[PDB]
Write an enzyme that holds these catalytic residues in place. Structure first.
Site, mmCIF file in Angstrom:
data_model
loop_
_atom_site.group_PDB
_atom_site.id
_atom_site.type_symbol
_atom_site.label_atom_id
_atom_site.label_comp_id
_atom_site.label_asym_id
_atom_site.label_seq_id
_atom_site.Cartn_x
_atom_site.Cartn_y
_atom_site.Cartn_z
ATOM 1 N N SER A 148 -10.757 11.990 -3.800
ATOM 2 C CA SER A 148 -10.342 11.506 -2.495
ATOM 3 C C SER A 148 -8.836 11.256 -2.514
ATOM 4 O O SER A 148 -8.216 11.229 -3.573
ATOM 5 C CB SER A 148 -11.084 10.224 -2.124
ATOM 6 O OG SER A 148 -10.657 9.126 -2.900
ATOM 7 N N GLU B 74 0.816 -1.226 0.000
ATOM 8 C CA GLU B 74 0.000 0.000 0.000
ATOM 9 C C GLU B 74 0.845 1.270 0.000
ATOM 10 O O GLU B 74 0.658 2.141 -0.852
ATOM 11 C CB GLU B 74 -0.943 0.012 1.210
ATOM 12 C CG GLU B 74 -2.102 -0.978 1.112
ATOM 13 C CD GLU B 74 -3.074 -0.661 -0.023
ATOM 14 O OE1 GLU B 74 -3.182 0.507 -0.452
ATOM 15 O OE2 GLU B 74 -3.747 -1.598 -0.508
ATOM 16 N N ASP C 13 -5.675 8.813 -0.485
ATOM 17 C CA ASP C 13 -5.316 7.716 0.421
ATOM 18 C C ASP C 13 -4.167 8.185 1.285
ATOM 19 O O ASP C 13 -3.183 8.712 0.758
ATOM 20 C CB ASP C 13 -4.834 6.485 -0.354
ATOM 21 C CG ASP C 13 -5.914 5.810 -1.177
ATOM 22 O OD1 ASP C 13 -7.100 6.121 -1.040
ATOM 23 O OD2 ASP C 13 -5.557 4.893 -1.957
ATOM 24 N N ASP D 204 -11.402 10.237 -8.102
ATOM 25 C CA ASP D 204 -12.642 10.789 -7.528
ATOM 26 C C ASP D 204 -12.425 11.980 -6.575
ATOM 27 O O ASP D 204 -13.382 12.466 -5.971
ATOM 28 C CB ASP D 204 -13.466 9.691 -6.835
ATOM 29 C CG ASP D 204 -12.793 9.150 -5.595
ATOM 30 O OD1 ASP D 204 -11.673 9.598 -5.307
ATOM 31 O OD2 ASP D 204 -13.374 8.271 -4.918
ATOM 32 N N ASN E 185 -6.763 10.128 -5.672
ATOM 33 C CA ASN E 185 -7.559 9.252 -6.521
ATOM 34 C C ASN E 185 -8.309 10.087 -7.539
ATOM 35 O O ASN E 185 -8.469 11.286 -7.348
ATOM 36 C CB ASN E 185 -8.542 8.454 -5.664
ATOM 37 C CG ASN E 185 -7.840 7.589 -4.615
ATOM 38 O OD1 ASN E 185 -8.203 7.606 -3.437
ATOM 39 N ND2 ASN E 185 -6.833 6.840 -5.040
ATOM 40 N N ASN F 136 -8.444 5.906 2.863
ATOM 41 C CA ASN F 136 -8.986 6.904 1.930
ATOM 42 C C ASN F 136 -10.038 7.843 2.524
ATOM 43 O O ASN F 136 -10.867 7.459 3.358
ATOM 44 C CB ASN F 136 -9.454 6.254 0.616
ATOM 45 C CG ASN F 136 -10.853 5.694 0.680
ATOM 46 O OD1 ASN F 136 -11.058 4.495 0.480
ATOM 47 N ND2 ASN F 136 -11.829 6.558 0.925
HETATM 48 O O1 PDC Z 1 -14.018 1.673 -0.565
HETATM 49 C C1 PDC Z 1 -15.215 1.679 -0.849
HETATM 50 O O2 PDC Z 1 -15.672 1.846 -2.001
HETATM 51 C C2 PDC Z 1 -16.236 1.504 0.204
HETATM 52 C C3 PDC Z 1 -15.959 1.477 1.568
HETATM 53 C C4 PDC Z 1 -17.029 1.320 2.415
HETATM 54 C C5 PDC Z 1 -18.306 1.189 1.912
HETATM 55 C C6 PDC Z 1 -18.516 1.225 0.542
HETATM 56 C C7 PDC Z 1 -19.852 1.079 -0.143
HETATM 57 O O3 PDC Z 1 -20.888 0.960 0.507
HETATM 58 O O4 PDC Z 1 -19.854 1.063 -1.391
HETATM 59 N N1 PDC Z 1 -17.485 1.365 -0.267
#
Ligand code: PDC
Ligand code: PDC
Ligand code: PDC
Ligand code: PDC
Ligand code: PDC
Ligand code: PDC
Ligand code: PDC
Ligand code: PDC
Ligand code: PDC
Ligand code: PDC
Ligand code: PDC
Ligand code: PDC
Ligand code: PDC
Ligand code: CL
Ligand code: EU
Ligand code: EU
Ligand code: EU
Ligand code: EU
Ligand code: EU
Length: 129
Positions: A50, A35, A52, A48, A46, A59
């Site tokens: 966000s 990681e 990490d 989107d 990322n 994230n």
């Molecule tokens: O990393 C992710 O995409 C993530 C983490 C927690 C919940 C959810 C989800 O409900 O899609 N998705």
């Protein structure tokens, strides 16, 4: 700080990760390796918007609030900056929530693709724990 694999193994064990949720210590060390390359200050943005953060690349969409990821769920109830500490405590506290939230360690994509199913015990070879 960039951890040594055994240095991190020992710290992770002190923070309760030796077989946490059935995942042996080597799984956690291997996850950190792939990681963050063991770097407590690693950050990766990322597509989107966000980011990490830290040793376990936690994230900001789901797990921590960095103030710059609109709609962050902040499931660890913590600023993402806390997860960039030289001390791993806050990251481990949050990792224990991540791993128990629905998908096990599959939450860590690098772990899935490089660690899962391998001889992860090799990651703690020779270590003083
Ligand atoms: O990393 C992710 O995409 C993530 C983490 C927690 C919940 C959810 C989800 O409900 O899609 N998705
Ligand atoms: O993480 C570490 O501290 C580490 C990793 C490999 C070898 C050694 C060593 O022999 O000290 N220490
Ligand atoms: O980088 C290292 O792992 C290191 C350096 C000096 C001593 C030790 C040790 O005693 O583990 N480990
Ligand atoms: O008094 C301490 O600081 C202590 C006690 C046990 C283990 C460790 C450690 O491994 O850091 N540190
Ligand atoms: O990170 C630590 O807690 C640490 C580091 C070096 C030595 C010790 C110790 O002997 O307690 N503890
Ligand atoms: O829990 C620990 O390991 C700990 C706590 C305070 C100081 C130290 C230290 O200097 O090693 N270690
Ligand atoms: O929490 C879990 O479901 C878990 C933990 C470790 C290994 C596995 C597995 O191999 O499925 N599953
Ligand atoms: O924010 C998310 O992680 C999200 C949003 C919609 C769908 C999904 C999904 O199916 O994982 N995940
Ligand atoms: O885009 C996403 O939200 C996504 C992608 C892969 C897995 C997951 C998940 O487990 O939520 N979510
Ligand atoms: O690679 C190894 O087998 C190894 C490395 C460091 C220490 C030890 C040991 O103390 O056994 N073993
Ligand atoms: O954890 C260790 O130190 C270790 C593990 C496997 C083999 C060896 C060895 O052959 O020395 N040492
Ligand atoms: O049991 C072990 O892991 C072991 C025993 C003797 C020497 C070594 C070594 O030199 O690595 N490792
Ligand atoms: O700070 C270090 O170098 C360290 C800490 C714990 C274990 C080990 C080791 O097994 O080498 N090395
Ligand atoms: Cl292991
Ligand atoms: Eu060492
Ligand atoms: Eu100590
Ligand atoms: Eu999702
Ligand atoms: Eu399972
Ligand atoms: Eu040996």
């Amino acid at each position: 700080k960039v951890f040594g694999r055994c240095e991190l193994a020992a710290a992770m064990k002190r923070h309760g990760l030796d077989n946490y949720r059935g995942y042996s210590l080597g799984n956690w060390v291997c996850a950190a390796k792939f990681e963050s390359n063991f770097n407590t200050q690693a950050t990766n943005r990322n597509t989107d918007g966000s980011t990490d953060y830290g040793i376990l690349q936690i994230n900001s969409r789901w797990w921590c609030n960095d103030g710059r990821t609109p709609g962050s769920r902040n499931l660890c109830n913590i600023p993402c900056s806390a997860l960039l500490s030289s001390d791993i405590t806050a990251s481990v506290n949050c990792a224990k929530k991540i791993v128990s939230d629905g998908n096990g360690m599959n939450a860590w994509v690098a772990w899935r693709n490089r660690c899962k199913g391998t001889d992860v015990q090799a990651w703690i070879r020779g270590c003083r724990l």
